[PDB]
Design a protein around this ligand. Structure first.
Ligand SMILES: N#Cc1ccc(N2CCN(Cc3ccc(COc4cccc5c4CN([C@H]4CCC(=O)NC4=O)C5=O)cc3)CC2)c(F)c1
Ligand SMILES: [Zn+2]
Lengths: 1127, 384
């Protein structure tokens, strides 16, 4: 009884693996990057990375490798899923179609066995004879590689050493040889085995066990001709080849441990290394020894190249370019030049790819445009900590700017031989018309020979029959094309002022006062076509198609929209367009291959209507609030077919996708007037003129997602937004080394040490040299410039957990409430905390209140003007007294630590890390808490959210989502006190934070939406989700359509959707219930016509009376398109 | 307070030599499929919460019970013990299955008295208690599953820093400055992914099996001198069960610990209980001090507390103490059926109500703890 719909609004960005090789073709060099469920195939070129293919796989890529067996032209890709869905894939392209064919597929899990503590290890024999997987302790799984092994049958081998740290295949062995480091109570040892496929067991290794360093961490296999293995630990780098043995103890690597590597030479002469703090090392192997043709090591000099992002997976691209794959920072593309050496660093950055993960906390705030939300996250960690500001809209990439003091209309003109190019544009000033002709990048003004100078021109375009028509306020004028001289001047019969002018390719309609005149363009002649009159003044007129069947006219004195036959005088149709104000601009467009009448009134409302091209007009009534200013509708050709730009205080681009007009905002403050300008210098551009300056630039394809970075150089923990102060309060932490002077020196310039004003907490309510100590800060950041306006430093040994910005009690002021806990290394459970209430005013931060609590304030919320706190395992309620001091009101003692607190009305949801969901209600007539229900189940819970008063969403172990509801209508107490669980889903992501909101325009739309509510969640990988509620019939229809989609869509690796989405746990797995996979439903639009015909045969689409068993195909389009607008 | 010389060879009490020497044993263990519904006979005349892994001596005299044991051994070797609540008369909803491993049937006194020792194996919740006319009711039992949780960092783990998740062995053993400094870096390196989540590292250390087991071991070693890995298992399930068995707590708290299905929750509850428990008092009095939290040690591998049988078949859970308070002795120290091979028990009584709180075990030979061994049972013993 939940019927939820979950979709991904932003695909994950964190990278957890990258390989290079000849994947698409034997000659091309590709970079395959796995972010989580997505596999991206790029092509490495001299300029950089050219994306080629994006593929979504039904799983999380835990292991990916490129191998080329014998008799193959290009490398194949072997991918293992965290659910043990092993597969082998092949790239296949035929001219324009890109498809990845699955060479083999199969689940390789075991019925019984504990997964290894070190994790999944997947290795391939360099001779391409076997695939070795270490999934379970004491069991080595081997998959033979033969063309007939299309089901991936694997056999297990018993391993006597249970704890294997790292294992890899050696190079240069006649038989498949593995080399690994294992742990014993006697210490750490390196051992080798000779795996034999024929008898399916191990053998004696080429070289016996050798004792290694106590912290031997990683094993790298040196290829031919050197052979052997290199063992890297915390304080030494060793090379082992049997008789050969060497070790080094360089001091530059003692600071941090190496966690990643990547070979840079085919012969393994040099190696690339990276550590935890993110600095590039260069292991150097010397081949100076050559006795009788044998090549052996001589030295292992280690050189530090520079500092980069915190890198998880290095990969050296061609010609001194390294792709630094970061997961907690930002992916980079840097240069390893050996001649720059600007200050001792060998590395300079080229590129930087966006990476929103990890998303520790987020908030939804209306920063710029009222009604549309914006996402502000706390991304990154350590030196990569930063604030990402996400927004939804079409991004106009600026190309040039010029100065114009409030232009009142722009129009390109053609005064050149026919070449389908734009040479000059006339800008209508306040009283004049300054033709700013610019063949290239000019800015001067060159008046047209056939156009007036100071007449406030209404329209100026290129008419048919080789002429340019420039209708001005006084009278409509024309200019010849080749002669370029005024040949015809269509003076008004009454010589009045042209109020509203409408011009077309070959017909011009001019409104003088309340009268309308129609004229037809003739070669070197202005022959009037018809004359007529109107009862009311013509507020707006527009004629669009050679010959317009009808002309749309607005009434100034009646506030109604009519369509009348241009070759005649009798109106074809009419309607009352609201009547609130006079219409501002009405246009006819064919955006969706139909006849649409977009009329915009002066109040900012578009009274959208549907008309008929042949005769008459339909109604198709629609009203959309496009802004608060009279928009100037102007279709710009730099689009799919026509598009429309409603230039107003809230600019929007009106484009038809699936016969349903989307209205996406633009990244501009306000546009006074816009016009296409396809200049030769800037083809397919668009000139938009604002209230101060006029810019020229292009636009994005459709409805992108834009991210703005604010680096802080320290880890941000929590973020809250304060409306009245126009500020963001963010908690942060920096690592400071413990020097031998009693102080704490920092490591790099952080945001807290670069603030305008700084403060240090001073309260009195209560080591080793080199140790790293956390220093916690509260940063106040302006919402416009995103500069750190303030930074408050807490006491020593104080850890700040929570942060709420809210107003308490009857106090008009809004405060920052922070809950901290004094933590010491000696003790495990904190015994004392602190509730501190700050108030940011006049750019100065002051401590309004300060309470001492005995425990750790794990979370706080705002409960109807009362601060609700969670001290250890107790939930307490605090009342804001008139003297600005928190006073306790009620307590409720639990047996679980209240890590999570969510309120909706008077329903408190209390959660912990043991998935022990608890529910509470606050009786206000009595003033004490009382428990309604309870649902305990041993598992790990990451986050929890209140979907509504009846259902609750949570994130569980193994990247799962669950939905629990209480049956308040149950007649038995035991059922009322228990929360029935009626939803399961395998998301594949670790959700940290849940928040209510949406990133699309909030429009009631009278009929509303098929989805109720909206919840966004952010994950560690940096993926933004969106979950909504659905109706019963809608859920049933979507489930049936999903089942039929499963049989038509061919997934990569042939992983079944039900198995992938099945609720997964180390102990017990169940099929998914109560959740609809929005990705699969939205994938319905990307398949061809016959596939969509196959999907729908008997869905019984209609539910509002009747069944309509045919169900058509475009009805599902009208369904999926309405489901796509929610994100 | 007798340190250093603890010479007892603390393994004989775990063998129960008082219950006969040539006791026939059985080869091994048995398995019951999880979440499966079984019929298991229930031997009466036992009222005690048996935590899994705890040995239970038993003497049976009545012909019905002896026959039940005989035909039980010829078909499986499993019976059921119900964890009776505070209310008597079969007011039980949870229980455990004891496994026979030592058996002998004996003919003296003209009876077929049977001596049997059995240890708990699984945990169950009884569905219905159907009574058989023979006298040995069989209970309709559902096997309660054992839940083991993976590392809290496994979900949010960084793929790169997996290889640094295999920590080296602890330095030396039970030595200062080799634990605090080791534990600090262990916490720093294990929970390094806690920055990806929204919680600090110490919060995740509060839910770590290793850290809680270390804290419990430290506090136990504070109580009595443990011999490092003195039979204390590395498996969190087994360690939790052993600690719950050896804790000096009452019946309701034992039932609460039994209800818990995860090791980590059990360890947290055990830590809370033995941090909040300092004294043990006389149940018939609730006013007299007999023991404390620090004057507690172990001459048995099962810890300070273990189950023994008097020659009349009644089962007593006994706690060993250096020095008791507010106790009086009656009768000469005799050693006819002493559970401890070398001591002569003297019955101990409350000095106020004269309730059987336990026994005083005077020594016999001189090269052992000189008459300082209080074996107080749980008949009248509650936390205070
Ligand atoms: N139906 C039937 C039926 C048939 C036969 C029965 N037989 C009757 C005769 N019994 C022999 C006998 C009786 C009496 C004693 C004295 O010892 C006693 C007495 C009472 C309580 C306790 C002890 C010792 N003791 C603890 C002290 C601490 C320690 O270390 N160990 C202990 O044992 C006690 O708590 C010794 C032997 C044998 C049984 C029968 F009783 C029922
Ligand atoms: Zn007493």
């Amino acid at each position: 009884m939940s019927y939820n719909y979950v979709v991904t609004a932003q695909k994950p960005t964190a990278v957890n693996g990258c390989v290079t090789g000849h994947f698409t073709s034997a000659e091309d060099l590709n970079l395959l990057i796995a972010k989580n469920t997505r596999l991206e195939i790029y092509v490495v070129t001299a300029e950089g990375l050219r994306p080629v293919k994006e593929v979504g796989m039904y799983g999380k890529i835990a292991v990916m490798e490129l191998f080329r067996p014998k008799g193959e032209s290009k490398d194949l890709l072997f991918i293992l899923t965290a659910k043990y869905n092993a597969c082998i894939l092949e790239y296949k392209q035929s001219g324009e179609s890109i498809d990845i064919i699955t060479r083999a597929h199969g689940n390789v899990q075991d019925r019984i066995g504990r997964p290894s503590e070190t994790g999944i290890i997947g290795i391939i024999d360099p001779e391409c004879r076997m695939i070795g997987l270490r999934l379970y302790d004491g069991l080595f799984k081997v998959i033979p590689l033969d063309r007939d092994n299309k089901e991936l049958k694997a056999f297990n081998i018993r391993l006597e050493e249970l704890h294997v740290i790292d294992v890899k295949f050696l190079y240069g062995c006649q038989a498949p040889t593995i080399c690994f480091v294992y742990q014993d109570p006697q210490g750490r040892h390196v051992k080798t085995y000779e795996v034999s496929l024929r008898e399916k067991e191990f053998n004696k290794g080429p070289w016996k066990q050798e004792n290694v360093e106590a912290e031997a961490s990683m094993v790298i296999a040196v290829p031919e001709p050197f052979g052997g293995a290199i063992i890297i630990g915390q304080e030494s780098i060793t090379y082992h080849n049997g008789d050969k043995y060497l070790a080094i103890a360089p001091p530059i690597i003692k600071q941090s441990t190496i966690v990643c590597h990547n070979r840079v030479d085919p012969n393994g002469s040099r190696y690339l290394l990276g550590d935890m703090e993110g600095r590039l090392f260069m292991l150097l192997l010397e081949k100076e020894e050559q006795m009788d043709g044998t090549v052996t090591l001589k030295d292992l000099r280690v050189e530090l190249l520079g500092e980069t992002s915190i890198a998880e997976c290095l990969t050296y691209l061609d010609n001194g370019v390294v792709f630094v794959g970061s997961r907690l920072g930002d992916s980079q593309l840097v240069k390893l030049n050996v001649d720059s050496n600007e200050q001792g660093s060998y590395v300079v950055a080229m590129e930087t790819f966006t990476n929103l993960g990890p998303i520790v906390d987020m908030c939804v705030v209306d920063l710029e445009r009222q009604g549309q939300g914006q996402l502000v996250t706390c991304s990154g960690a350590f030196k990569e900590g930063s604030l990402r500001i996400i927004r939804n809209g079409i991004g106009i990439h600026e190309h040039a700017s010029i100065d114009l003091p409030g232009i009142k209309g722009l129009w390109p003109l053609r005064s050149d031989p026919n070449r389908e190019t734009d040479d000059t544009l006339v800008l209508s000033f306040v009283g004049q018309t300054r033709v700013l002709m610019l063949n290239g990048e000019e800015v001067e003004e060159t008046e047209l020979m056939g156009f007036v100078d100071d007449q406030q021109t209404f329209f100026c375009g290129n008419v048919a029959h080789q002429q340019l028509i420039q209708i001005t306020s006084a009278s409509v004028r024309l200019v010849s094309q080749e002669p370029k001289a005024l040949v015809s001047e269509w003076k008004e019969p009454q010589a009045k002022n042209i109020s509203v002018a409408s011009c077309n390719s070959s017909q011009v309609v001019v409104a003088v006062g309340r009268a309308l005149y129609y004229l037809q363009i003739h070669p070197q002649e202005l022959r009037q076509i018809s004359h007529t009159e109107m009862e009311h003044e013509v507020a707006c007129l527009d004629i669009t198609p050679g010959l317009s069947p009808l002309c749309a006219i607005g009434l100034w004195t009646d506030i109604s929209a009519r369509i009348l036959k241009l070759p005649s005088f009798e109106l074809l149709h009419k309607e009352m367009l609201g009547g609130e104000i006079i219409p501002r601009s009405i246009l006819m467009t064919t955006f969706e291959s139909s006849h649409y009448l977009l009329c915009a009134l002066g109040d900012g409302a578009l009274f959208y209507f549907g008309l008929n091209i042949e005769t008459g007009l339909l109604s198709d009534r629609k009203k959309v609030t496009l802004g608060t200013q009279p928009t100037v509708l102007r279709t710009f050709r730099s689009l799919s077919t026509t598009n429309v730009f409603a230039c107003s205080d809230r600019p929007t681009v009106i484009y038809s996708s699936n016969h349903k007009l989307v209205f996406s905002n633009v990244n501009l403050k306000e546009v006074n007037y816009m016009c296409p300008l396809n200049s030769d210098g800037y083809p397919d551009s668009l000139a938009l003129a604002n209230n101060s300056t006029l810019t020229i630039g292009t636009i994005d394809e459709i409805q992108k997602l834009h991210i703005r970075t604010v680096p802080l150089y320290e880890s941000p923990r929590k973020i809250c937004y304060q409306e009245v102060s126009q500020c963001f309060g963010v908690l942060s932490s920096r690592i400071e080394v413990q020097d031998t002077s009693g102080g704490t020196t920092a490591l790099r310039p952080s945001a807290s040490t670069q603030a305008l004003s700084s403060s240090v907490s001073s309260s009195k309510l209560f080591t080793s040299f080199g140790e790293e100590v956390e220093v916690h800060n509260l940063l106040i950041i302006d919402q416009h410039t995103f500069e750190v306006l303030h930074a408050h430093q807490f006491l020593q040994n104080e850890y700040a957990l929570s942060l709420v910005s809210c107003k308490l009690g009857k106090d008009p002021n809004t405060y920052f409430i922070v809950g901290t806990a004094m933590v010491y290394p000696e003790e495990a459970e904190p015994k004392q905390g602190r509730i501190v209430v700050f108030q940011y005013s006049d750019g100065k931060l002051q401590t309004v209140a300060e309470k001492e609590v005995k425990g750790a304030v794990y979370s706080m919320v705002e409960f109807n003007g009362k601060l609700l706190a969670s001290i250890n395992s107790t939930v307490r309620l605090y009342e804001w007294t008139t003297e600005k001091e928190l006073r306790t009101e009620c307590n409720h003692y639990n047996n679980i630590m209240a890590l999570y607190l969510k309120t909706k009305g008077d329903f408190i949801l209390v959660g912990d890390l043991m998935r022990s969901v608890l529910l509470l209600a606050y009786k206000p007539m009595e003033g004490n808490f009382e428990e309604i229900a309870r649902d305990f189940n041993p598992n790990w819970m990451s986050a929890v959210e209140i979907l509504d008063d009846d259902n609750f969403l949570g994130a569980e172990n193994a990247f799962n989502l669950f939905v629990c509801q209480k049956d308040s209508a149950a007649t038995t107490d035991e059922e009322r006190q228990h929360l029935q669980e009626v939803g399961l889903f395998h998301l594949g992501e670790f959700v940290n934070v849940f928040c209510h909101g949406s990133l699309v325009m909030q429009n009631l739309g009278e009929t509303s939406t098929p989805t109720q509510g909206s919840v966004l969640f952010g994950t560690v990988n940096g993926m933004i989700g969106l979950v909504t509620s659905l109706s019963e019939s809608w859920y049933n229809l979507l489930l049936d359509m999903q089942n039929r989609l499963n049989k038509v869509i061919k997934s990569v690796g042939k992983i079944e959707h039900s198995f992938w989405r099945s609720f997964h746990t180390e102990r017990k797995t169940e099929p998914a219930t109560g959740f609809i996979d929005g990705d699969l439903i939205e994938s319905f639009l990307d398949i061809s016509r016959p596939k969509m015909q196959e999907v729908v045969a008997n869905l019984q689409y209609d539910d509002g009376s009747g069944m309509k068993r045919e169900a058509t195909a475009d009805d599902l389009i009208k369904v999926v398109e309405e489901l796509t607008r929610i994100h | 307070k007798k340190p250093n010389i603890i010479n007892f060879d603390t393994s004989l009490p775990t063998s129960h030599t008082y219950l006969g020497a040539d006791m026939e044993e059985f080869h091994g263990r048995t398995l019951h499929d999880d979440d499966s519904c079984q019929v298991i006979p229930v031997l009466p005349q036992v009222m005690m919460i048996l935590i899994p892994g705890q040995t239970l001596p038993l003497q049976l005299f009545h012909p019905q019970e002896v026959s039940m044991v005989r035909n039980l051994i010829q078909k499986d070797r499993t019976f059921a013990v119900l964890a009776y609540s505070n209310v008597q008369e079969r007011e039980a909803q949870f229980g455990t299955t004891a496994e026979i491993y030592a058996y002998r049937e004996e003919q003296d006194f003209g009876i077929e008295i049977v001596k049997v020792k059995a240890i708990g194996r699984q945990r169950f919740k009884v569905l219905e208690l159907r009574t058989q006319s023979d006298g040995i009711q069989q209970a309709k039992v559902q096997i309660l599953p054992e839940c083991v949780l993976p590392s809290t960092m496994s979900a949010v783990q960084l793929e790169s820093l997996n290889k640094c998740q295999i920590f080296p062995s602890k330095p030396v053993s039970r030595e200062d400055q080799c634990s605090y400094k080791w534990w600090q870096k262990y916490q720093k390196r294990k929970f390094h992914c806690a920055n990806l989540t929204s919680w600090p590292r110490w919060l995740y250390s509060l839910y770590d099996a290793e850290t809680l087991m270390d804290r419990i071991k430290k506090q136990l070693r504070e109580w009595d001198e443990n011999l490092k890995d003195d039979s204390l298992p590395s498996n969190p399930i087994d360690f939790s069960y052993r600690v719950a068995a050896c804790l000096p707590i009452d019946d309701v708290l034992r039932i609460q610990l039994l209800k818990i299905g995860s090791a980590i929750q059990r360890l947290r509850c055990e830590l809370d209980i033995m941090n909040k428990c300092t004294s043990l008092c006389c149940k018939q009095c609730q006013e007299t001090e007999i023991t404390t939290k620090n004057e507690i040690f172990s001459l048995s591998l099962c810890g300070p507390m273990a189950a023994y049988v008097n020659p009349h078949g009644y089962v007593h859970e006994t706690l060993t103490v250096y020095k008791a308070c507010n106790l009086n002795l009656i009768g000469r120290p005799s050693t006819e059926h002493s559970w401890f091979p070398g001591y002569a028990w003297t019955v101990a009584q409350c000095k106020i109500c004269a309730s059987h709180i336990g026994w005083k075990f005077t020594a016999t030979k001189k090269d052992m703890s000189p008459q300082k061994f209080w074996g107080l049972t749980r008949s009248a013993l509650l936390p205070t």
